[PDB]
Amino acid sequence: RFLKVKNWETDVVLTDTLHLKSTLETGCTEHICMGSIMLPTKDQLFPLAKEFLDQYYSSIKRFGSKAHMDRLEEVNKEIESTSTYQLKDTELIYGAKHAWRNASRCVGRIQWSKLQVFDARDCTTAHGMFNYICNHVKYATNKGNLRSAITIFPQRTDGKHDFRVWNSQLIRYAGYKQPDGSTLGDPANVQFTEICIQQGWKAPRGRFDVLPLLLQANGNDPELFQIPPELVLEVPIRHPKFDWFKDLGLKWYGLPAVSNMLLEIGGLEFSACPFSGWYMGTEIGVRDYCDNSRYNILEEVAKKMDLDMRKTSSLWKDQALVEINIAVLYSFQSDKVTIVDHHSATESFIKHMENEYRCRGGCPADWVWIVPPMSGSITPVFHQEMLNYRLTPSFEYQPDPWNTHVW
Amino acid sequence: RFLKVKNWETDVVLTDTLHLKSTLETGCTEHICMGSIMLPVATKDQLFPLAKEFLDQYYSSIKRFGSKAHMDRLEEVNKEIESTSTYQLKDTELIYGAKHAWRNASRCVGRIQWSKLQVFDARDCTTAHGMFNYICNHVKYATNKGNLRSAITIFPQRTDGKHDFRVWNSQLIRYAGYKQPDGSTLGDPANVQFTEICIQQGWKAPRGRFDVLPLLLQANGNDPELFQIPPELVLEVPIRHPKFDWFKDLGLKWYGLPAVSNMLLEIGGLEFSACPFSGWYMGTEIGVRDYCDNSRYNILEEVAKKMDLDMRKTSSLWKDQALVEINIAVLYSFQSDKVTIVDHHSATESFIKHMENEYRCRGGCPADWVWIVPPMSGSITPVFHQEMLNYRLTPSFEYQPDPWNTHVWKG
Ligand code: HEM
Ligand code: HEM
Ligand SMILES: Cc1cc(N)nc(C[C@H]2CNC[C@H]2NCCNCCc2cccc(F)c2)c1
Ligand SMILES: Cc1cc(N)nc(C[C@H]2CNC[C@H]2NCCNCCc2cccc(F)c2)c1
Numbered sequence: 001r002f003l004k005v006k007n008w009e010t011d012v013v014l015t016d017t018l019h020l021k022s023t024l025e026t027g028c029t030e031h032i033c034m035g036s037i038m039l040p041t042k043d044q045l046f047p048l049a050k051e052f053l054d055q056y057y058s059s060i061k062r063f064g065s066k067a068h069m070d071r072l073e074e075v076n077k078e079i080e081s082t083s084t085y086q087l088k089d090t091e092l093i094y095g096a097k098h099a100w101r102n103a104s105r106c107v108g109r110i111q112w113s114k115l116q117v118f119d120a121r122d123c124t125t126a127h128g129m130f131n132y133i134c135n136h137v138k139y140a141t142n143k144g145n146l147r148s149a150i151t152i153f154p155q156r157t158d159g160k161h162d163f164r165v166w167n168s169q170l171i172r173y174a175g176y177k178q179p180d181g182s183t184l185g186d187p188a189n190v191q192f193t194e195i196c197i198q199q200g201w202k203a204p205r206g207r208f209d210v211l212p213l214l215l216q217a218n219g220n221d222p223e224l225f226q227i228p229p230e231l232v233l234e235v236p237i238r239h240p241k242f243d244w245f246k247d248l249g250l251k252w253y254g255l256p257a258v259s260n261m262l263l264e265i266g267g268l269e270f271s272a273c274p275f276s277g278w279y280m281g282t283e284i285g286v287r288d289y290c291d292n293s294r295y296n297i298l299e300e301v302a303k304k305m306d307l308d309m310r311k312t313s314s315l316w317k318d319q320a321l322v323e324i325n326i327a328v329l330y331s332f333q334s335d336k337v338t339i340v341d342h343h344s345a346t347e348s349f350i351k352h353m354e355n356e357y358r359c360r361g362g363c364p365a366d367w368v369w370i371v372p373p374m375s376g377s378i379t380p381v382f383h384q385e386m387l388n389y390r391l392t393p394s395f396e397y398q399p400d401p402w403n404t405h406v407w
Numbered sequence: 408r409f410l411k412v413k414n415w416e417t418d419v420v421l422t423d424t425l426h427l428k429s430t431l432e433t434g435c436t437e438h439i440c441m442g443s444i445m446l447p448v449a450t451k452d453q454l455f456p457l458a459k460e461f462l463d464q465y466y467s468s469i470k471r472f473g474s475k476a477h478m479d480r481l482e483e484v485n486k487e488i489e490s491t492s493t494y495q496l497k498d499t500e501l502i503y504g505a506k507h508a509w510r511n512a513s514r515c516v517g518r519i520q521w522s523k524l525q526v527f528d529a530r531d532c533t534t535a536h537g538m539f540n541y542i543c544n545h546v547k548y549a550t551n552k553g554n555l556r557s558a559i560t561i562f563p564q565r566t567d568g569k570h571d572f573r574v575w576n577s578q579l580i581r582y583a584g585y586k587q588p589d590g591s592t593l594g595d596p597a598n599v600q601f602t603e604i605c606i607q608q609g610w611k612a613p614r615g616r617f618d619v620l621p622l623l624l625q626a627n628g629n630d631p632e633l634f635q636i637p638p639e640l641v642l643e644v645p646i647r648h649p650k651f652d653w654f655k656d657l658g659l660k661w662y663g664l665p666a667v668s669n670m671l672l673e674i675g676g677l678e679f680s681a682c683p684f685s686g687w688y689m690g691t692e693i694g695v696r697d698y699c700d701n702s703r704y705n706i707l708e709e710v711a712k713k714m715d716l717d718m719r720k721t722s723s724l725w726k727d728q729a730l731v732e733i734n735i736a737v738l739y740s741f742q743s744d745k746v747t748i749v750d751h752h753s754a755t756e757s758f759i760k761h762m763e764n765e766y767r768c769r770g771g772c773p774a775d776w777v778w779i780v781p782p783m784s785g786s787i788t789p790v791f792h793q794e795m796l797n798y799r800l801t802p803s804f805e806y807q808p809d810p811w812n813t814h815v816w817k818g
């Protein structure tokens with residue numbers, strides 16, 4: 001029932017009671033741990049709705065009140081009638097903030113309550129989506145003073161009238177397969193980039209081409225739109241010490257904005273719910289730039305640094321990795337674009353965990369994702385035991401739309 | 408039931424069936440994952456089934472399943488259990504068992520080497536002096552003047568739980584730690600408690616930063632006894648840096664032989680409470696964990712100062728910069744002194760090959776991602792990108808309570 005988590009650096013021990021309220025399954029069993037696997041009706045809806053409303057009314061200290069019982073009856077009647085129901089604005093904002101709060105893979109949750117929620121449930125077309133999204137982009141960017149935001153499009157109905165953003169993130173760089181056999185730009189987006197060209201996009205065919213938005217309203221064919229360049233804040237990447245760094249031709253965008261996930265609140269499913277915060281430096285510097293299957297710039301940078309690249313044991317990869325990540329953080333800070341380093345972000349997360357344990361009885365956290373992809377053990381989260389479990393409201397994965405869509 | 412694991416860098420997909428053989432529990436449930444939790448007498452009743460399952464495994468491995476030799480062995484063990492409440496492993500079974508415990512060790516990234524283990528049978532040992540002699544021989548053999556060889560020494564099994572053989576040291580070779588009145592620590596802070604016990608037992612401590620601890624050895628449930636490992640047997644490496652001449656002036660050194668001595672080895676239901684085993688180091692164990700953990704030697708600030716890094720803000724990544732330099736130094740020093748060491752790039756690449764092999768020949772490879780991924784530069788190693796499945800197979804190495812917490816003092 002009660003579970004302890006220990007921090008092996010500080011000896012601080014926390015007691016988790018919040019897991020007892022978990023409703024979805026983890027993928028693990030008593031016999032096998034799947035902790036490192038990336039992807040591990042009318043009748044159905046009323047318990048889900050009831051569970052959520054009870055959470056909500058409890059949160060505002062009105063559990064079992066007249067408003068509470070009356071809301072539960074109103075929702076019951078609407079489900080009995082229409083097969084679905086509608087969230088109040090207050091419930092929608094609560095549900096969104098809590099889906100972020102419950103995101104066990106998110107290191108930046110100390111910020112969970114500050115989310116700006118844009119209600120786009122009145123949207124009907126792809127042009128309308130484009131408009132909402134441009135507005136979200138400009139608001140969240142805030143000329144470099146980034147603010148966290150989510151834009152919420154209409155909920156799933158029969159599932160043949162889905163709102164979807166086909167992009168994985170709102171702002172990403174194109175990837176093209178070449179005659180040469182190699183890849184120009186971002187290789188993760190090769191497939192998406194070719195679907196855009198298939199739909200009519202005139203590709204500039206460069207290394208950092210901001211992809212068009214491809215938007216699907218109400219189950220219809222998706223439509224292409226170019227985001228106004230003045231709305232896409234980009235940072236040229238230079239190094240505080242290495243003059244040649246600027247010459248590598250590197251840049252990245254300021255706004256990380258996940259657009260392919262599903263928001264689940266009280267059994268209602270929001271299949272188009274792009275949300276954005278700001279970067280931790282390592283996402284760009286370690287993952288985007290240095291993954292083998294991404295921009296893979298490690299070979300080139302070590303070359304400019306004149307490191308000994310003959311044997312892995314000179315740690316040439318590791319040395320270059322650090323310089324690159326210094327060059328991401330310096331550039332963003334010099335341009336006054338919000339960014340956090342992995343040391344600061346993980347320190348905040350430990351503080352957040354402590355807050356959540358004392359105020360809420362726990363914090364679901366996925367160690368495999370929380371610990372940064374560089375310098376793991378010099379960050380405090382490495383030494384922190386974490387319990388992973390699934391609470392709702394939640395953000396969930398969903399299949400890529402190009403496999404699902406019926407034209 | 409067939410489970411798939413994908414490598415997200417290479418798209419290679421593997422299929423696990425071996426998990427079906429797993430008996431024991433992980434600590435996770437359908438509703439909670441405890442994958443990051445560090446630590447999530449036996450009767451005749453329970454013993455024969457454990458023995459049978461082990462001997463079935465063993466006889467399958469040698470292609471003699473269902474043979475007369477197989478059947479006679481099951482009979483002889485069954486008879487021995489009913490007669491004596493326990494049984495004795497044959498030498499061949501003990502070797503197979505110890506190698507498989509290593510093969511099954513899901514937290515170990517060095518398992519490509521599993522079949523080359525040298526097994527020393529010390530089941531005829533009766534005294535702590537006898538333990539000391541066996542351990543010296545293990546250390547000399549494993550050390551091999553810098554050309555390290557994997558080894559394990561196996562002392563007599565648990566009987567009634569009152570006559571346990573134990574090595575009180577967590578590793579055969581480690582450095583003392585001393586808490587000073589001002590609250591600072593001299594030497595290795597991980598070993599403060601153990602060092603205090605040693606001193607209480609009568610060890611005369613030189614009270615320096617790298618004092619090799621004495622062995623504290625318990626035979627047959629008796630009170631443990633102190634022994635000094637002969638210093639000529641303890642290979643040590645002074646740490647210097649290929650480019651930074653001042654690095655040597657930090658006065659750092661480390662020992663060559665990593666030798667875990669506080670784990671329990673389980674084979675066919677038998678429990679070997681003293682089974683010290685050794686391999687050789689991956690650099691990050693020393694350079695990242697031993698030197699840079701805040702609760703260990705904690706040398707980051709001092710190195711960063713000597714490097715004249717900007718230490719006023721974390722986002723200069725001064726900690727990360729110093730970290731890499733320290734780890735270059737550890738690898739360079741070991742290689743220069745011709746002492747076996749593996750870097751985290753090479754060890755992780757070898758682990759992926761081993762894992763692919765194991766899935767194909769064995770139907771799986773239990774692996775604990777949290778432990779396998781190195782503590783620096785995670786995602787530039789191929790293991791970061793490899794999905795893994797963690798489950799518990801026997802034979803196995805298990806943790807056991809520290810002996811000072813459980814021992815009954817005879818005085
Ligand atoms: C404000 C600053 C934020 C920071 C620094 C931050 C940081 C991160 C990081 C480092 C990850 C790991 C993702 C990866 O490695 O690809 C992550 C994942 C995640 N974040 Fe946060 N985040 C922030 C804001 C948000 C917001 C506003 C939301 C939702 C409203 C959110 C929801 C999530 C979710 C659902 C994941 C898991 C995504 C997945 O499984 O791929 N984050 N975040
Ligand atoms: C041959 C070279 C070897 C290498 C490079 C190696 C590497 C490692 C590493 C890096 C770890 C994680 C240790 C930590 O972070 O504390 C580990 C753990 C482990 N290794 Fe290996 N190892 C080797 C040999 C062996 C041998 C010979 C055995 C026993 C026969 C063994 C059994 C284990 C076990 C049981 C663990 C888990 C320890 C724990 O949970 O505390 N290893 N090894
Ligand atoms: C909101 C927010 C803020 C922030 N700093 N960072 C983020 C993650 C974004 C940006 N940088 C990486 C990207 N990550 C989001 C997408 N992750 C998918 C990983 C994946 C792939 C395939 C199968 C799976 F099961 C899972 C979001
Ligand atoms: C045999 C071998 C080879 C090798 N390269 N490396 C090793 C690990 C040794 C050496 N370098 C670290 C040390 N690690 C072994 C002891 N670690 C126990 C951690 C622990 C703490 C508390 C609760 C737990 F459940 C677990 C062994």
Ligand SMILES: C[C@H](O)[C@H](O)[C@H]1CNc2nc(N)[nH]c(=O)c2N1
Nearest residue numbers: 036037038368369791792793794
């Ligand atoms: C196989 C493994 O689960 C996968 O590589 C994970 C590991 N940890 C991660 N951690 C974060 N933050 N982001 C990721 O994409 C991943 N990938």
Ligand SMILES: C[C@H](O)[C@H](O)[C@H]1CNc2nc(N)[nH]c(=O)c2N1
Nearest residue numbers: 382383384385443444445777778
């Ligand atoms: C809390 C967490 O599980 C703990 O710090 C683990 C993380 N991974 C590790 N990995 C290895 N190899 N060794 C360790 O001691 C640890 N510590």
Ligand SMILES: [Zn+2]
Nearest residue numbers: 028033435440
């Ligand atoms: Zn698990």
